[PDB]
Design an enzyme around this catalytic site. Structure first.
Site, PDB file in Angstrom:
ATOM      1  N   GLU A 189     -11.322 -12.108  -2.181  1.00 16.73           N
ATOM      2  CA  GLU A 189     -10.481 -12.587  -1.080  1.00 16.73           C
ATOM      3  C   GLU A 189     -11.281 -13.699  -0.451  1.00 16.73           C
ATOM      4  OE1 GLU A 189      -8.070 -10.101   1.347  1.00 16.73           O
ATOM      5  OE2 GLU A 189      -8.999 -11.046   3.299  1.00 16.73           O
ATOM      6  N   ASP A 208       2.279   1.809   3.539  1.00 10.25           N
ATOM      7  CA  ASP A 208       2.996   0.717   4.205  1.00 10.25           C
ATOM      8  C   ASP A 208       4.520   1.109   4.152  1.00 10.25           C
ATOM      9  OD1 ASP A 208       1.149  -2.093   2.748  1.00 10.25           O
ATOM     10  OD2 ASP A 208       0.740  -0.866   4.554  1.00 10.25           O
ATOM     11  N   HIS A 241       0.891  -1.148   0.000  1.00 12.44           N
ATOM     12  CA  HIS A 241       0.000   0.000   0.000  1.00 12.44           C
ATOM     13  C   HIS A 241       0.948   1.222   0.000  1.00 12.44           C
ATOM     14  CE1 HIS A 241      -2.972  -2.464   2.180  1.00 12.44           C
ATOM     15  NE2 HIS A 241      -3.856  -1.769   1.571  1.00 12.44           N
ATOM     16  N   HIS A 248     -13.355 -12.768   2.786  1.00 14.79           N
ATOM     17  CA  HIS A 248     -14.378 -11.765   2.480  1.00 14.79           C
ATOM     18  C   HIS A 248     -15.611 -12.478   1.964  1.00 14.79           C
ATOM     19  CE1 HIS A 248     -11.484  -8.164   1.479  1.00 14.79           C
ATOM     20  NE2 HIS A 248     -11.177  -8.702   2.607  1.00 14.79           N
ATOM     21  N   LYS A 272     -15.950  -6.692  -0.225  1.00 14.25           N
ATOM     22  CA  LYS A 272     -15.963  -7.051   1.222  1.00 14.25           C
ATOM     23  C   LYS A 272     -17.325  -6.589   1.765  1.00 14.25           C
ATOM     24  CE  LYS A 272     -13.312  -6.902   5.519  1.00 14.25           C
ATOM     25  NZ  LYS A 272     -12.104  -6.252   6.101  1.00 14.25           N
ATOM     26  N   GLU A 287     -11.821  -4.972  -5.217  1.00 12.64           N
ATOM     27  CA  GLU A 287     -11.936  -5.914  -4.122  1.00 12.64           C
ATOM     28  C   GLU A 287     -13.102  -5.705  -3.143  1.00 12.64           C
ATOM     29  OE1 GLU A 287      -8.224  -6.559  -1.787  1.00 12.64           O
ATOM     30  OE2 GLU A 287      -9.333  -7.877  -0.561  1.00 12.64           O
ATOM     31  N   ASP A 289      -6.671 -12.959  -3.498  1.00 13.90           N
ATOM     32  CA  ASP A 289      -6.144 -12.839  -2.158  1.00 13.90           C
ATOM     33  C   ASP A 289      -6.536 -14.158  -1.440  1.00 13.90           C
ATOM     34  OD1 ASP A 289      -5.197 -10.288  -2.508  1.00 13.90           O
ATOM     35  OD2 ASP A 289      -6.639  -9.430  -1.038  1.00 13.90           O
ATOM     36  N   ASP A 305      -8.333 -13.342   8.803  1.00 17.54           N
ATOM     37  CA  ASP A 305      -7.083 -13.299   8.032  1.00 17.54           C
ATOM     38  C   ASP A 305      -6.117 -14.379   8.476  1.00 17.54           C
ATOM     39  OD1 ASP A 305      -7.945 -11.146   6.569  1.00 17.54           O
ATOM     40  OD2 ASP A 305      -7.067  -9.601   7.828  1.00 17.54           O
ATOM     41  N   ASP A 361     -13.328 -10.508  10.343  1.00 20.02           N
ATOM     42  CA  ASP A 361     -12.306 -10.962   9.358  1.00 20.02           C
ATOM     43  C   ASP A 361     -11.053 -11.399  10.160  1.00 20.02           C
ATOM     44  OD1 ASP A 361     -12.457  -8.168   9.669  1.00 20.02           O
ATOM     45  OD2 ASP A 361     -11.039  -7.788   7.950  1.00 20.02           O
ATOM     46  N   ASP A 401      -3.000 -12.745   1.700  1.00 24.25           N
ATOM     47  CA  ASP A 401      -3.410 -11.518   2.469  1.00 24.25           C
ATOM     48  C   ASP A 401      -3.980 -12.014   3.816  1.00 24.25           C
ATOM     49  OD1 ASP A 401      -5.753  -8.690   1.829  1.00 24.25           O
ATOM     50  OD2 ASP A 401      -4.356  -8.962   3.351  1.00 24.25           O
ATOM     51  N   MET A 411       1.836  -6.277  -7.782  1.00 24.60           N
ATOM     52  CA  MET A 411       0.664  -5.461  -7.419  1.00 24.60           C
ATOM     53  C   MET A 411       1.029  -4.407  -6.420  1.00 24.60           C
ATOM     54  SD  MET A 411      -1.859  -5.109  -5.095  1.00 24.60           S
ATOM     55  CE  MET A 411      -1.758  -6.487  -3.945  1.00 24.60           C
TER      56      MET A 411
HETATM   57  O1  LIG Z   1      -9.953  -6.375   4.359  1.00 26.69           O
HETATM   58  C1  LIG Z   1      -8.720  -5.659   4.099  1.00 26.69           C
HETATM   59  C2  LIG Z   1      -8.305  -5.882   2.654  1.00 26.69           C
HETATM   60  O2  LIG Z   1      -8.337  -7.306   2.496  1.00 26.69           O
HETATM   61  C3  LIG Z   1      -6.929  -5.242   2.297  1.00 26.69           C
HETATM   62  O3  LIG Z   1      -5.846  -6.015   2.835  1.00 26.69           O
HETATM   63  C4  LIG Z   1      -6.759  -5.145   0.805  1.00 26.69           C
HETATM   64  O4  LIG Z   1      -6.653  -6.436   0.214  1.00 26.69           O
HETATM   65  C5  LIG Z   1      -5.889  -4.090   0.201  1.00 26.69           C
HETATM   66  O5  LIG Z   1      -6.267  -2.759   0.630  1.00 26.69           O
HETATM   67 MG   LIG Z   2      -7.464  -8.359   0.537  1.00 29.57          MG
END
Ligand SMILES: OC[C@@H](O)[C@H](O)[C@@H](O)CO
Ligand SMILES: [Mg+2]
Ligand SMILES: OC[C@@H](O)[C@H](O)[C@@H](O)CO
Ligand SMILES: OC[C@@H](O)[C@H](O)[C@@H](O)CO
Ligand SMILES: OC[C@@H](O)[C@H](O)[C@@H](O)CO
Ligand SMILES: [Mg+2]
Ligand SMILES: [Mg+2]
Ligand SMILES: [Mg+2]
EC number: 5.3.1.5
Lengths: 393, 393, 393, 393
Positions: free
Chosen positions: A215, A55, A52, A218, A181, A179, A243, A255, A253, A291, A86
């Site tokens: 993702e 980041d 990002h 998501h 969500k 993306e 992702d 992750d 979420d 991710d 990316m």
């Molecule tokens: O839910 C957060 C998202 O998954 C981020 O990590 C993106 O993939 C990029 O901004």
């Molecule tokens: Mg993501």
């Protein structure tokens, strides 16, 4: 199982650099130097790294500071051989983005947000990125009267089409991947699922270079089938990036590492990425990007273990998915269940509606009770798939 | 509050005719004669009635039987003055449809299913229906290896495009409305949400006459915002029909009376149907159709009470939504929160990417910390909306 | 990995006998004879069979027919040697139970339901069952004001304690097991999760002989951790029976084969039944009962495949969890993460609260920041279980 | 509908003091001084304030500073007259509590956490709190093999009983209230719902002074009926405190204003606290505590609006539920549906199980089909509550 750069495993800087702060606690880990992340990921077998803008380059960074940071990061890239496939923009952490970036109700903020993306396209282009991801996480609402819903989508279209137009104007080889969500951080996010993202792209002026970045977690947060959603994205030829992570149910979420969530669903996602569709169809060819977030309970030894687990999980699933489809027992079970039969068109060559309605065999003299007797044997085919996943076959 | 035929409240024959059988029990009510349903709904204030071919004409019905049933039903329609705005096909109750109609793995069954729809278009056309709904409830799987996912969508496209082509060929004024549902009866259904339905329509040869039929409880079963999904359907001008009912959370499909599920979400859905978008946009103009089931605990006195409750709920929400937007206090709160501001384009007339990236005011000299201080006051606007719903305002 | 009667695998007559009617369709398979059911289950390796009163003896049977059906049933048990370890009552299918059995608002239905249960306890004792299960499927509501919630619980107590006192009075060697379910078929079921059911048992007069009958999918419908829940039932020494199957998410009750739902959680479920607790404690020594339904897309060959599949799945998982725990690398990983450390009491033998308070090294002189540095290494521990599960270790 | 101190509305220092950091962003509001917090809450009509140890006294404060901050805090309570009815301990923010307080795998963190709690009980007694709340936010796991589940519960027991024995030993007039939560911040939290928490209290040595502290959104995150849950806590006489807020579905913990989540369930929640049970029984006479967070999009004006909103919402609902129950048409509807009928015992005074069994009119001669005909009229009853709620009756 050893990841080689040919596997195309990419990791974001914010993944292994995720420090541990969550809603009820502070960070449990120190900040990761970007230079170290690049060396570390290259020793583990990464193909690439993603980031990002914030980041890497701080929000308030001066010009002098920006060049040092980039000098340091291009050095590392050069030294290790890692690529940058990316690059994405942070339109969610600064308080300014509290109501969104592209769909903020404040117009001056919408303008800053779009400026911040345009400048970022330049940087992405200079890094050699193929994909530009947009995750609109602050785009949405807690309350139903907060937004003019049609205006929110018009505003959304304005920004994505301006960013696409500019790509085209500048001659950059970048495609935008949106993306979806459903929620978190907003109570409801705009373009909540793969389907909403795909529909939105069709209303775009420059949608030709705009596709998706689904993702795993998501889609699972709405309780959908992640493999079914990517299969709709693939079919429409809009699967530009992916992702991969894990999620254990409908809740915040998580992750988690890829494969550390719904395991059978992970098996079937690997199968589709690696074997494609049973009757042929488009195939996904890009980075296998993770991710996720190394759990805050674990120290830096856990961080590199977690990064490693992602590629191991993936290679272990791949070994089983190839074996699974290679088994003659599975091939027979597939045919019996009608998996290849589904690929034959329903109508005959040059048959019309009229032609079919009239065919007596097809309707009027069709023996429905007789046809209803077929044993599809879906259970047996699913037992066969699980035995290949457990490696007992 | 009294429904008048001008309200356009329509009910399906299977709604009030739902007899009570569920997964752990038998029917608690006797079958409803269709003739009585038509008279009863006309006395309550209905505008119209809708049905599935097998709600009316039995699967095995002979020719003699088919004409009696239609003679009886057109009589009733003529006597009461009720219209038939929508007609649908039952491609889910007979055992033959166990793996689907259009996406069955067995090809002979796909052919019967499509024949059964074509014949039904004719009937719909003869009844004077404006809309043809397709709900593919058996289209999907329990298991991830049961289907060739790209083939499933190709098969799906074949059937919808053949049905659309025929409409066009025959000259009928009917539009097809597809109806998404995430799960039940299958573990995962194809085209699970409004977004998936909209995306699929764009891949269609004759998509120009194909749009959606969202149902309140169906979007809520994935935990989505029903008002946000219909607003995306409206924006793309694809909201052809609507099914209104209630749902109390992510679980089996309850089919409760409209307003008997998420109440605030019902308030905001009525607001969008009746007031449209705060800055202007397309407006929904069709039937307000209730697709619910009178709870099995209640006798026929409850059946007509339930039908009545649907139209009362709707008129009560409507009275409050009109009052809500009419309040000057609410208008001021809206402006303050940036609801009209969202409608101003982000860029200026003839401003390009380049033009905006360069504007120093927009990015480089933008005071982000200052802009982040705006009090959007979304809470206050939401408190105002709830006080209008509770009629204490 | 051939089950044998020693394994204690039990199956309900209604699982394999489930003909396929769901809410949008009719049965797709012919009725299954109970004598056929016993012979077939005995050739596959089952140890026993369970049933609901009406699964064997129709609601309407005359005494003559009850005794006639029981004689052929006991003959078949005799010829094969299957045991009958659990018996249950149907208090949900007939229209009379539309508001519940024990908690029906109507007093005459509560008495009829209780009398139904009491005569069923006589049959249970006669058969040699050790467990009498109570799933209150229709005890609940769709609407919050439908019931007085305190009175509903007095009425559940009164029925369970009356049944318990009768057991004690007749000297039957039976235990009652309650089965919690969050919803389906009621919108809200009373005693919705394992916890509710354990709390309720503590207010009973005859609590000593009342325990639980948790079902995998039932806790997964509320998004809970099945392993955590049975852990809690086991720790309280209330795990008297268990119902195993599969569920893929928060949605309608799917009743898949055990292992065809959340695979990783199934692994950990098998680990606790089979291995128990790492530091030692209670163990579940009862039958392993499969409460599932063969998917309706499949013929009778799929029915027997499905039943086979349950047993296979459990033995495959069983094998991987014995290897998992026996593994020296897993035991060291367990030691590092503090699994045995949690086994030690927090306070010293004889240490009082006042003592701990006063120990400067435990509080005033404790280095909270040094203690926060520990790598718990939970990701690696988790990655080790999954490689054991995928049969790679 | 102006709250007054008589209403018993309490607020936590961390609710209105919540600055806005969520998982994808930093605070959007400046810190709120606790003296400012007391004065402001007292001008709005609050009766009292609650806090976590670290909300007032920093983790690092020297004794000098602890005593300095307490003097200005008590001064402010003195000047305004707010009471301090509940006190709690923060066992979740500092990095040391990454695996839990009481159930940390590390023994030295369990002792530090317990010592932290014991000194906090001394402050609680000093303040005049009647309730000491324990929310074990980090007690759980992400992974199933991370913990020994029996040992986790022995370690929770040991901490709660040690704290309880100390209370008893010092003669403090305090009760401990546990607060269940299904997830967030752990993937799985121990004692996830109201039931789990009630069952657990029954295994405690000092159970008599341990009760519950249910929170609206916490049960709604598992999809449970909040009214049913507190009903069950109330019926067991374990409802010692209550946390009220809003939640719109199964997703991350939103902590909205009470009434801004599931409105109809809020109505029924207010009905039970305010009116109790229709046939009579227990009543909750404690404080009405608001555990929420003002949305981060809003300034400090929205913070005080939000706090006002909680009180308004509860008084609006309060009014409609007093009118609902007072209404003669509702009382007749209640009578028809059997709400008072459920109040009568199933068995006759002196009737034994043997007696009921033997009563031919209750079983052998009962007309199950005539009894199944009753119209329970639950839809009409439900429609009457909603018109009272929308202020139309
Ligand atoms: O839910 C957060 C998202 O998954 C981020 O990590 C993106 O993939 C990029 O901004
Ligand atoms: Mg993501
Ligand atoms: O979930 C069932 C569906 O809602 C149907 O009632 C359709 O609307 C028409 O086939
Ligand atoms: O969801 C259904 C329940 O699982 C029942 O099958 C009980 O186990 C037996 O009455
Ligand atoms: O979800 C957070 C919990 O509600 C806490 O706020 C406790 O109530 C207080 O520690
Ligand atoms: Mg519908
Ligand atoms: Mg069961
Ligand atoms: Mg709380």
């Amino acid at each position: 199982v050893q990841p080689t750069p040919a596997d195309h495993f990419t990791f974001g800087l914010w993944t292994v650099g995720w420090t541990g702060a969550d809603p009820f606690g502070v960070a449990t880990r120190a900040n990761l130097d970007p230079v170290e992340a690049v060396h570390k990921l290259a020793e583990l077998g990464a193909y690439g790294i993603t980031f990002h803008d914030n980041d890497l380059i701080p929000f308030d960074a001066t010009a002098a500071e920006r060049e040092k940071i980039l000098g340091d990061f291009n050095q590392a890239l050069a030294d290790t051989g890692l690529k940058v496939p990316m690059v994405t923009t942070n339109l969610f952490s600064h308080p300014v983005f509290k109501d969104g970036g592209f769909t903020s109700n404040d117009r001056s903020i919408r303008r800053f947000a779009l400026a911040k993306v345009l400048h970022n396209i330049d940087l992405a282009a200079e890094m050699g990125a193929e994909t530009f991801v947009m995750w609109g996480g602050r785009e949405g609402s807690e309350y139903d009267g907060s937004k003019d819903l049609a205006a929110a989508l018009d505003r959304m279209r304005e920004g994505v089409d301006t960013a696409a137009g500019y790509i085209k104007d500048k001659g950059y080889n970048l495609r935008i991947a949106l993306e979806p969500k459903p929620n978190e951080p907003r109570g409801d996010i705009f373009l909540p699922t793969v389907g909403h993202g795909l529909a939105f792209i069709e209303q775009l002026e420059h949608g030709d270079i705009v596709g998706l970045n689904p993702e795993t977690g998501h889609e699972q947060m709405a309780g959908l089938n992640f493999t079914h959603g990517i299969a709709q994205a693939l079919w429409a030829e809009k699967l530009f990036h992916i992702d991969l992570n894990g999620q254990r149910g409908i809740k915040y979420d998580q992750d988690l590492v890829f494969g550390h969530g719904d395991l059978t669903s992970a098996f079937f996602t690997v199968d589709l990425l690696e074997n494609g569709f049973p009757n042929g169809g488009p195939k996904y060819t890009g980075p296998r990007h993770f991710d996720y977030k190394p759990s805050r309970t674990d120290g830096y030894d856990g961080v590199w273990d977690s990064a490693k687990a992602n590629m191991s999980m993936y290679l272990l699933l791949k070994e089983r998915a190839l074996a699974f489809r290679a088994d003659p027992e599975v091939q027979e079970a597939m045919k019996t269940s009608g998996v290849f039969e589904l690929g034959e068109t329903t109508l005959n060559a040059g048959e019309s509606a009229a032609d079919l309605m009239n065919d007596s065999a097809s309707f009027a003299g069709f023996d429905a009770e007789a046809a209803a007797e077929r044993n599809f044997a879906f259970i047996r085919l699913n037992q066969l798939a699980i035995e290949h996943l457990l490696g007992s076959r």
